[PDB]
Amino acid sequence: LKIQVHYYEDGNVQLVSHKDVQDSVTVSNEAQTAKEFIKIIEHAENEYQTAISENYQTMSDTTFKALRRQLPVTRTKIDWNKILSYKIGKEMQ
Amino acid sequence: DPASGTALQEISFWLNLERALYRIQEKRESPEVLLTLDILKHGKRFHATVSFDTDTGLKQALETVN
Amino acid sequence: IANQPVVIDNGSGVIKAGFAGDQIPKYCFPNYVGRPKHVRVMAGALEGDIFIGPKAEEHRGLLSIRYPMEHGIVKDWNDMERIWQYVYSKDQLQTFSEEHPVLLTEAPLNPRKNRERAAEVFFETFNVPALFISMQAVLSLYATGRTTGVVLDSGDGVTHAVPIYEGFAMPHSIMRIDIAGRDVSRFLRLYLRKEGYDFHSSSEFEIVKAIKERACYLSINPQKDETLETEKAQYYLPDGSTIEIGPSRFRAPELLFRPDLIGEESEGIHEVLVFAIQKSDMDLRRTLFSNIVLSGGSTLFKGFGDRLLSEVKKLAPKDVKIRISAPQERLYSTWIGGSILASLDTFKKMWVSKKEYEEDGARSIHRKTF
Numbered sequence: 086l087k088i089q090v091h092y093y094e095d096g097n098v099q100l101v102s103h104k105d106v107q108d109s110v111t112v113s114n115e116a117q118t119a120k121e122f123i124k125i126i127e128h129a130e131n132e133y134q135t136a137i138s139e140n141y142q143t144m145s146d147t148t149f150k151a152l153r154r155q156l157p158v159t160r161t162k163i164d165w166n167k168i169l170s171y172k173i174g175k176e177m178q
Numbered sequence: 179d180p181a182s183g184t185a186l187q188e189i190s191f192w193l194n195l196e197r198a199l200y201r202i203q204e205k206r207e208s209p210e211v212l213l214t215l216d217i218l219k220h221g222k223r224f225h226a227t228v229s230f231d232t233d234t235g236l237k238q239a240l241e242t243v244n
Numbered sequence: 245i246a247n248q249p250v251v252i253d254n255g256s257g258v259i260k261a262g263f264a265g266d267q268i269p270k271y272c273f274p275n276y277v278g279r280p281k282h283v284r285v286m287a288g289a290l291e292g293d294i295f296i297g298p299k300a301e302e303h304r305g306l307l308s309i310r311y312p313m314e315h316g317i318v319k320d321w322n323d324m325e326r327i328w329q330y331v332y333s334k335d336q337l338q339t340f341s342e343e344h345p346v347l348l349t350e351a352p353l354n355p356r357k358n359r360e361r362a363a364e365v366f367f368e369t370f371n372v373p374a375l376f377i378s379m380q381a382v383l384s385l386y387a388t389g390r391t392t393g394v395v396l397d398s399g400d401g402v403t404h405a406v407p408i409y410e411g412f413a414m415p416h417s418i419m420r421i422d423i424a425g426r427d428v429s430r431f432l433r434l435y436l437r438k439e440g441y442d443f444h445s446s447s448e449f450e451i452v453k454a455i456k457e458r459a460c461y462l463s464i465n466p467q468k469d470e471t472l473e474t475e476k477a478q479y480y481l482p483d484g485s486t487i488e489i490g491p492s493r494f495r496a497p498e499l500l501f502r503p504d505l506i507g508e509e510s511e512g513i514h515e516v517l518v519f520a521i522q523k524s525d526m527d528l529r530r531t532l533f534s535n536i537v538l539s540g541g542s543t544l545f546k547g548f549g550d551r552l553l554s555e556v557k558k559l560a561p562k563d564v565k566i567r568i569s570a571p572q573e574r575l576y577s578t579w580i581g582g583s584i585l586a587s588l589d590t591f592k593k594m595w596v597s598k599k600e601y602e603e604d605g606a607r608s609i610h611r612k613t614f
């Protein structure tokens with residue numbers, strides 16, 4: 086189930102994903118495996134779309150925090166006047 | 179002012195500064211002054227010791243003089 | 245330029261001072277002011293009215309000891325001026341307040357007026373070349389040498405926890421309650437009255453402090469020990485009497501872990517630590533739990549650290565290494581940290597010059613408060 090989504094309003098963003106679904110069932114009958122094939126399909130697709138949405142939900146604090154935090158670990162802004170004015174004590178350990 | 183006075187006065191003034199800063203280095207290198215510095219170092223007071231060479235602009239003055 | 249920075253560690257109960265670079269504070273004495281109560285009759289008596297330091301401690305019976313600072317906030321500035329002036333006297337420093345920059349410890353979350361009027365006092369009556377007000381937790385961590393960790397202090401009038409990350413003391417996680425040593429002594433006085441022994445004189449409250457300093461401990465189980473009758477050890481007064489304490493020795497410092505006994509909606513020390521840690525970045529909780537430093541004289545009770553460990557384990561999440569350090573200089577932690585901080589070359593750029601104070605004013609201090 087490969088997905089490609091592009092968005093470029095005042096920028097550029099591309100979502101590329103796929104889930105290597107793997108499932109099995111014995112071919113019992115035709116109508117049974119037809120709607121059962123749909124059962125596996127509805128399962129994996131509802132699962133996959135929902136999971137993708139929640140991956141978007143947990144992205145401000147996990148993925149981005151792997152790249153760039155929203156706020157530093159001190160949870161405050163930067164006193165540029167402090168860093169430039171004097172060394173924070175980094176020389177001392 | 180670099181143009182204050184005649185040419186020989188300004189040129190001789192830079193010469194005077196050269197030998198005078200060397201005399202300041204002479205007064206700096208005496209063992210009595212070093213003894214006072216040793217007192218402040220042995221007494222764990224690093225302020226006057228480090229400032230004796232950094233706060234005094236004698237080092238940079240002597241290097242430009244040289 | 246000046247001679248050397250003087251690290252004056254304040255404290256609502258014990259002021260501590262000395263020059264920077266010193267190993268231990270050479271000058272420490274209680275932060276009280278005693279003036280006589282009786283009548284001068286015989287000539288040749290103790291001349292002078294206000295006494296501070298060892299002389300005020302010696303002739304303790306005559307004085308009417310009061311404190312000018314309470315809960316890290318100065319209530320009387322005249323007595324504080326005399327105390328600071330006493331620090332610069334011939335009995336303590338023998339120097340002048342014109343050739344020494346001053347490092348000044350100060351408790352967090354205090355009013356702006358403390359820094360403002362204290363700065364006026366120094367730069368105007370003392371005319372110090374440079375003043376620098378700082379925190380106390382930052383100094384205690386500098387004294388231990390490590391750099392990231394919380395600091396749990398409980399001096400005489402305040403108690404707080406500061407999660408420090410490499411020197412940047414996180415200002416959004418400093419919990420602070422006002423239940424410290426002096427208040428524990430006060431509650432101990434109440435319990436001594438309930439025992440039958442009365443101590444109410446101002447120069448007798450100090451005896452109550454002495455009892456707190458050498459006859460109290462912390463029970464591990466707070467209730468199991470209350471349901472038993474202890475050995476009821478005695479106590480010798482300076483007078484020579486005898487006081488059997490009993491249950492009024494473990495419930496007295498119990499106040500720090502439950503300020504319900506004093507009737508207050510504040511929290512215990514353990515809750516101050518856990519809230520100070522939990523109101524921080526989730527990525528630093530394990531590092532903060534692995535580095536807790538105690539300081540302040542109220543952390544000297546018997547069984548203090550052990551009970552703190554038990555309490556924190558009850559509040560911390562499961563299987564997180566909790567580690568409480570407790571150096572041997574909890575009384576001198578902030579002062580030793582001041583000696584390390586002010587003895588650096590960056591301190592020249594870290595203070596506030598007198599010229600700057602005359603130019604901008606108090607706003608310059610709040611600007612360069614860190």
Ligand SMILES: Nc1ncnc2c1ncn2[C@@H]1O[C@H](COP(=O)(O)OP(=O)(O)O)[C@@H](O)[C@H]1O
Nearest residue numbers: 254255256257258399400425457541542544545
């Ligand atoms: N052995 C002790 N046990 C319990 N409390 C003590 C002991 N020694 C001192 N104290 C209390 O601790 C206080 C000292 O803390 P202090 O140094 O005043 O902190 P700060 O100086 O930051 O106010 C004193 O008021 C005293 O009441």
